[PDB]
Amino acid sequence: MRLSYEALEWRTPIENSTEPVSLPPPPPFFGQERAREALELAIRGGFHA
Amino acid sequence: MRLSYEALEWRTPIENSTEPVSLPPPPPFFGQERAREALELAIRGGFHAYLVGPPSLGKHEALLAYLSTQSVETPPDLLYVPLSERKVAVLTLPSGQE
Amino acid sequence: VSLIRPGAVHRAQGGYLILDALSLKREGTWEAFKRALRNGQVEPVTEPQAPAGLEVEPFPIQMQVILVGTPEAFEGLEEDPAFSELFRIRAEFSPTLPASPENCTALGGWLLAQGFQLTQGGLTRLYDEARRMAEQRDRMDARLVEIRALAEEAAVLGGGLLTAESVEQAIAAREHRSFLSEEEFLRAVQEGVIRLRTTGRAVGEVNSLVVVEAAPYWGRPARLTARAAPGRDHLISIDREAGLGGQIFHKAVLTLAGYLRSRYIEHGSLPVTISLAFEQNYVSIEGDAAGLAELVAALSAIGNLPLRQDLAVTGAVDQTGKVLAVGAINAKVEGFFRVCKALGLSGTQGVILPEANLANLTLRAEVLEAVRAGQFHIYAVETAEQALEILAGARMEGFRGLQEKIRAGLEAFARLEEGHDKEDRE
Amino acid sequence: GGQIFHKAVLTLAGYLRSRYIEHGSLPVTISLAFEQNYVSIEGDAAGLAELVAALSAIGNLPLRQDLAVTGAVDQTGKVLAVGAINAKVEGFFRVCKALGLSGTQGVILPEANLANLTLRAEVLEAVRAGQFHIYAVETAEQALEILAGARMEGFRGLQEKIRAGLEAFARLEEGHDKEDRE
Amino acid sequence: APAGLEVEPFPIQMQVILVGTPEAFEGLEEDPAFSELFRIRAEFSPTLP
Amino acid sequence: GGQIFHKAVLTLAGYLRSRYIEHGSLPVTISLAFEQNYVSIEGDAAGLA
């Protein structure tokens, strides 16, 4: 079955190359909630990690 | 056969998650009567013993706690005496005469 | 003489000298320690660059020595007769304690003496988790360090009070911190990168529950496939007999071949060749055990039997057909449940596990909750025949039973062999 | 190295002996060779290209050189996904573009790497233009029928061609054995 | 040198955090004392949502 | 050297079979030997001798 171009298209559409964006800095370990939670537990409990 | 929920339930039901409980300390080597009896025999007789068990069983923790409660007469003061310039021997003197 | 320093031997006199067996084996001082114990010959270590030493007179030993070590550390030490002659008392800790209210009380008292604030629910949850670590419904794990570590994590997560919710959250966090491999596997299954079948029926294909490489061995299903061809009586395991494994049978191929050759006889030999395959290279199959999934897959391939893909099949078998217990049954069952729940439960999924592991089934809250709602099932089989009946959903002996279809398949393959021989004759 | 099967020889042999059963034994020997060896294929990977090439050699099926086939397969016939599919697809597209796109070239890949398909702008533009083809296959049968340009439906299908080729090779062996005997 | 100073054992008040690739710990997790000491596994997923 | 016909005996068998056709097989065993043992025959092809 030949697959359409739409199913192959994956890049989110670009809206503009102007107006540079300004976003707040993210908290450390963004997207790594497992690692952040493990390190929080290690720090609060004093365990070796 | 199909196992029912009643057969698969292995957890003891929780009476309550509150009302903190106070319990007496367990005896040394609780549930380890064989290790306790082997150590009783070893210390009572002075045999060299060896403790065997899976790691993280706190084998060292009980063993030290069990030996700390043991009592024997004061160990004599051992000291090296030179029999010559080259010959030295381990000499044991009674307590306090070193 | 004034430059002689004490060792452990010189300050344990009149008392106890506690060593580590692993340390003695590792540091290579076991021979010197043995000679110190037997002959009373303890002498300070002399540097090889010194010009002269001190002839230390043999010292009668008034100490007693207690070694401490794991069974693997002492099995390499008990071999020489001198160890048996010297160390005559074996204080052996059992890896598990009886699971009884007395031991629950003792564990609670021990944790309270360790400096935790426990509730009844928290202590009960720790007790059940000790059972779960022991992987037995009647024995709790004697490794009190592991229980103390779990209690410490529960105290940190609860602020100091070990309530039932606190310990459950600690257990969930402990499971999740090493959940990356299972998260990757579930994500791949959802994306279709790793394709499994938890719905419908298929021939020669069954979900064999295996374990992956990690400190917390994680169970997960693998698409075990058996394909049968007409030929000589020879079973091939591509995963086990890969490459240099062609010569070497691993006792698993021989077991399955023995069961197949002995059970089904209307021909003087087994007229089929069975190919056993595991998807990808995460299965890490142990050679010594021949899985029940392998046998039922081979039977389906021979007899053209549509096996249910809802039910994952785990367990070992011998040549008799009796299903043997397997280790880590909890990991396998819970891994299959994770895979099914990721893809969505339908109400007919389940696991076929040996009856011999009925005593080792300590399952998390979610699996038992599914069993309560009937969205997941656990089937205990004592013979490979029962597992095949459950997978194919019919009796072996009756009207058009599974046995008759297996005979028909073997007969068809034998007639194909006869046709080949007749072709060769002319 | 012929003693080590690399787990790929046994897989293909089992699939061939199981899927096509019309004889008591498999009378065919398949030799696979790479001209201008630059491949260094993984031992544990039984590529779909090897399976389709062996199957075509057995059945005398004209495979299209326009389309590329890649991916590992088991001895059941359900094609397994492979890593670095993006690099392979882009390399084949680059080769086709250097040799000139013909409007009928394409790549056949398992239907397990669709979540792994992340390509360049030029490849996407070629796909939109209809000058390059993307084919997703779940089983080796689909890849075979696409690559040979014919289905199994009706007379002159591929399955009967495979059976005829197997029968012809078996009869060649039978004639050799007959001449040896008499 | 003839000999150093017999440093007495010291209680450890520090928390050790190892850092490494999974291949670096697969050769190190085999020792049971590693699991005994280091009990917090802060795993960084190779990919983010 | 007993293993593998070395394709030099096969040449002789093929010539005997093709040039003289009265059977499908070769009805004789030909034992070829060299007096002494310094010959060290190359196995590349069958010799005319």
Side-chain angles (χ1 to χ4, degrees):
Chain A
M1 186 66 204
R2 196 257 183 173
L3 188 62
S4 52
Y5 153 75
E6 312 198 4
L8 265 294
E9 179 62 30
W10 59 273
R11 292 183 276 99
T12 175
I14 300 170
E15 196 267 328
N16 55 7
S17 179
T18 68
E19 60 179 0
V21 76
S22 195
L23 310 161
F29 308 124
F30 65 98
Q32 306 278 10
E33 65 183 1
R34 181 187 290 107
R36 166 185 70 75
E37 283 185 57
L39 286 171
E40 287 177 9
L41 178 58
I43 293 319
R44 287 182 301 139
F47 310 140
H48 302 246
Chain B
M1 52 155 178
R2 194 250 181 200
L3 294 177
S4 65
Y5 162 59
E6 288 57 40
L8 280 165
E9 182 67 60
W10 61 276
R11 315 162 311 200
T12 52
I14 287 154
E15 174 194 317
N16 52 5
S17 58
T18 61
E19 296 313 307
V21 74
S22 68
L23 279 189
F29 310 90
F30 70 102
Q32 305 273 46
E33 302 147 10
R34 162 190 296 113
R36 184 163 58 209
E37 288 168 83
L39 276 188
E40 279 189 72
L41 181 46
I43 296 89
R44 273 198 290 151
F47 313 135
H48 309 330
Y50 61 106
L51 272 61
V52 187
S56 298
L57 200 136
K59 309 184 288 294
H60 288 106
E61 307 180 5
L63 175 60
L64 266 292
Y66 178 82
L67 293 178
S68 299
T69 58
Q70 210 81 22
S71 172
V72 56
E73 64 183 1
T74 49
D77 287 335
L78 73 163
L79 61 84
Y80 267 94
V81 297
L83 314 180
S84 66
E85 284 83 2
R86 67 180 177 90
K87 199 85 168 53
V88 297
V90 179
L91 192 146
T92 53
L93 280 190
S95 188
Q97 288 82 18
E98 212 286 339
Chain C
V1 59
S2 289
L3 309 174
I4 297 169
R5 303 284 148 251
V9 175
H10 296 93
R11 47 178 191 270
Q13 298 305 288
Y16 316 94
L17 178 52
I18 302 175
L19 286 86
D20 277 23
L22 181 62
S23 179
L24 280 163
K25 194 33 81 183
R26 175 172 329 251
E27 308 308 305
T29 61
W30 169 236
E31 291 293 330
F33 190 45
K34 182 188 290 181
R35 164 181 40 258
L37 280 171
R38 288 188 292 173
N39 309 122
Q41 182 214 290
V42 56
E43 56 181 6
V45 55
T46 301
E47 295 215 358
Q49 83 191 350
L54 295 175
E55 182 75 8
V56 179
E57 182 181 293
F59 170 43
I61 290 297
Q62 313 144 220
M63 85 182 168
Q64 85 189 251
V65 171
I66 303 179
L67 300 186
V68 188
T70 71
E72 48 175 333
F74 280 111
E75 52 87 11
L77 214 60
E78 281 160 355
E79 309 169 347
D80 73 80
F83 177 82
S84 305
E85 295 177 69
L86 278 169
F87 299 87
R88 291 189 175 263
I89 301 299
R90 206 189 153 92
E92 194 141 27
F93 294 105
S94 43
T96 49
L97 314 175
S100 64
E102 292 196 318
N103 271 18
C104 187
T105 307
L107 171 63
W110 186 83
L111 287 164
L112 289 174
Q114 289 307 302
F116 304 135
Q117 193 50 13
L118 291 171
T119 80
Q120 188 47 62
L123 162 68
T124 304
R125 183 61 193 136
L126 283 171
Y127 174 51
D128 294 334
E129 180 56 40
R131 284 170 151 178
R132 169 68 161 73
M133 293 183 286
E135 292 184 328
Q136 291 196 248
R137 296 170 67 214
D138 304 315
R139 303 296 288 220
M140 65 179 288
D141 205 18
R143 298 187 293 167
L144 308 165
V145 170
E146 297 290 332
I147 306 182
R148 204 189 59 232
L150 186 67
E152 283 262 15
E153 290 170 42
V156 176
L157 278 151
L161 184 61
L162 279 77
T163 47
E165 292 80 69
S166 182
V167 174
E168 278 186 314
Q169 184 177 2
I171 292 164
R174 176 171 285 217
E175 292 284 76
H176 170 70
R177 286 189 311 257
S178 64
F179 200 72
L180 179 63
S181 164
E182 200 80 341
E183 180 71 14
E184 267 280 346
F185 183 85
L186 267 70
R187 175 191 95 201
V189 164
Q190 292 281 123
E191 290 180 5
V193 176
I194 302 187
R195 180 94 59 172
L196 309 190
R197 293 187 54 159
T198 68
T199 300
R201 308 217 298 203
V203 60
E205 187 186 323
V206 69
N207 302 115
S208 196
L209 298 180
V210 296
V211 291
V212 298
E213 281 63 65
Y217 272 15
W218 284 111
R220 52 173 78 159
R223 181 221 65 239
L224 179 62
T225 42
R227 291 292 194 232
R232 77 279 190 191
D233 44 358
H234 184 58
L235 273 75
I236 190 167
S237 180
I238 62 170
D239 52 354
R240 285 188 287 237
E241 291 186 71
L244 302 195
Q247 201 272 299
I248 290 169
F249 308 96
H250 309 87
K251 176 203 140 163
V253 173
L254 293 173
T255 289
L256 296 167
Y259 175 88
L260 293 167
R261 290 183 290 214
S262 64
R263 189 41 82 180
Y264 306 110
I265 47 170
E266 72 182 358
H267 303 151
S269 287
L270 182 81
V272 298
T273 302
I274 308 294
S275 64
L276 299 181
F278 267 117
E279 183 263 358
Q280 204 204 80
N281 61 336
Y282 68 83
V283 290
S284 186
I285 300 303
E286 296 311 299
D288 307 337
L292 167 61
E294 289 178 306
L295 183 53
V296 297
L299 296 169
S300 64
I302 290 161
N304 189 246
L305 293 172
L307 295 198
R308 286 159 65 176
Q309 307 287 279
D310 299 327
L311 305 171
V313 176
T314 190
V317 287
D318 61 356
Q319 60 170 49
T320 304
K322 180 200 259 169
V323 185
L324 300 200
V326 291
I329 185 66
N330 297 295
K332 293 166 191 206
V333 174
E334 301 216 290
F336 194 60
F337 187 21
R338 275 186 295 267
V339 163
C340 287
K341 183 182 41 73
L343 290 168
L345 313 167
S346 68
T348 61
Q349 285 83 15
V351 172
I352 293 170
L353 58 85
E355 170 88 340
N357 266 338
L358 183 63
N360 282 18
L361 271 193
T362 52
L363 295 183
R364 279 286 175 263
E366 51 180 59
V367 177
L368 304 185
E369 181 65 26
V371 169
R372 264 221 291 270
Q375 295 297 109
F376 201 70
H377 305 286
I378 296 294
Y379 286 100
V381 300
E382 183 178 1
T383 309
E385 299 175 304
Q386 292 190 82
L388 187 69
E389 293 189 12
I390 287 153
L391 286 152
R395 294 301 151 211
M396 311 265 268
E397 291 305 20
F399 183 66
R400 298 195 299 180
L402 282 71
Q403 204 70 354
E404 300 87 300
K405 314 163 71 73
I406 297 169
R407 310 260 191 250
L410 294 157
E411 187 68 80
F413 294 132
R415 304 281 61 51
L416 292 151
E417 269 196 321
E418 162 178 50
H420 180 39
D421 291 330
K422 188 271 202 179
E423 283 191 53
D424 292 332
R425 187 180 51 72
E426 295 179 35
Chain D
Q3 187 63 256
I4 183 166
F5 302 95
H6 294 99
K7 165 193 171 293
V9 176
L10 314 170
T11 295
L12 293 182
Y15 173 83
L16 278 174
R17 287 172 301 191
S18 72
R19 185 64 67 221
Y20 312 139
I21 296 171
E22 78 185 344
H23 297 117
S25 299
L26 185 64
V28 298
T29 290
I30 296 85
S31 296
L32 312 170
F34 276 106
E35 179 179 290
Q36 292 289 320
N37 56 331
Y38 209 92
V39 296
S40 189
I41 307 297
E42 315 90 300
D44 308 329
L48 187 50
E50 303 179 65
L51 172 56
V52 298
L55 196 151
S56 67
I58 301 299
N60 187 7
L61 301 180
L63 301 183
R64 300 159 63 177
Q65 304 304 304
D66 305 330
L67 278 72
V69 288
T70 182
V73 65
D74 66 15
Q75 46 90 40
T76 300
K78 185 222 71 193
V79 180
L80 305 191
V82 285
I85 187 66
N86 279 355
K88 285 173 188 151
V89 172
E90 294 175 356
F92 190 70
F93 174 71
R94 285 172 283 214
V95 161
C96 294
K97 181 266 290 181
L99 292 177
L101 311 179
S102 61
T104 187
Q105 295 150 321
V107 292
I108 294 185
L109 74 164
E111 198 175 332
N113 292 292
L114 57 91
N116 293 340
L117 287 173
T118 47
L119 305 183
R120 324 192 51 68
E122 64 197 290
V123 184
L124 278 160
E125 289 303 83
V127 173
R128 184 61 300 171
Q131 201 168 9
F132 184 76
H133 285 311
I134 193 66
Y135 266 119
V137 297
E138 287 286 354
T139 58
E141 289 198 0
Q142 298 177 31
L144 172 71
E145 71 186 4
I146 301 299
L147 188 63
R151 299 289 190 270
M152 194 255 268
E153 310 280 290
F155 190 48
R156 301 186 294 283
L158 282 72
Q159 186 56 43
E160 49 255 50
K161 285 161 168 174
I162 301 299
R163 275 160 152 221
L166 192 59
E167 178 71 71
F169 292 164
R171 279 176 181 157
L172 288 166
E173 282 291 82
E174 161 185 304
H176 185 63
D177 298 323
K178 183 261 291 180
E179 294 164 62
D180 280 346
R181 181 172 67 258
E182 288 181 89
Chain E
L5 308 176
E6 309 181 348
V7 179
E8 281 282 303
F10 181 75
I12 301 299
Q13 283 74 228
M14 61 155 197
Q15 284 80 17
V16 182
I17 296 170
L18 296 185
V19 193
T21 60
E23 293 83 3
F25 291 113
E26 285 165 61
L28 187 59
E29 279 168 45
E30 287 160 286
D31 166 271
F34 181 74
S35 304
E36 181 185 2
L37 284 168
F38 299 92
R39 309 198 163 262
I40 299 306
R41 211 190 182 209
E43 204 148 348
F44 279 79
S45 54
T47 60
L48 295 174
Chain F
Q3 311 312 123
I4 302 157
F5 314 130
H6 298 121
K7 303 199 307 184
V9 161
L10 301 174
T11 286
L12 296 151
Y15 170 82
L16 292 168
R17 262 162 177 177
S18 302
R19 186 55 46 112
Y20 304 72
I21 61 170
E22 68 272 16
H23 280 96
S25 312
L26 176 74
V28 297
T29 59
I30 287 284
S31 176
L32 296 169
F34 285 78
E35 199 198 42
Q36 287 70 231
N37 44 19
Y38 54 78
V39 291
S40 286
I41 305 307
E42 291 298 293
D44 308 330
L48 172 60

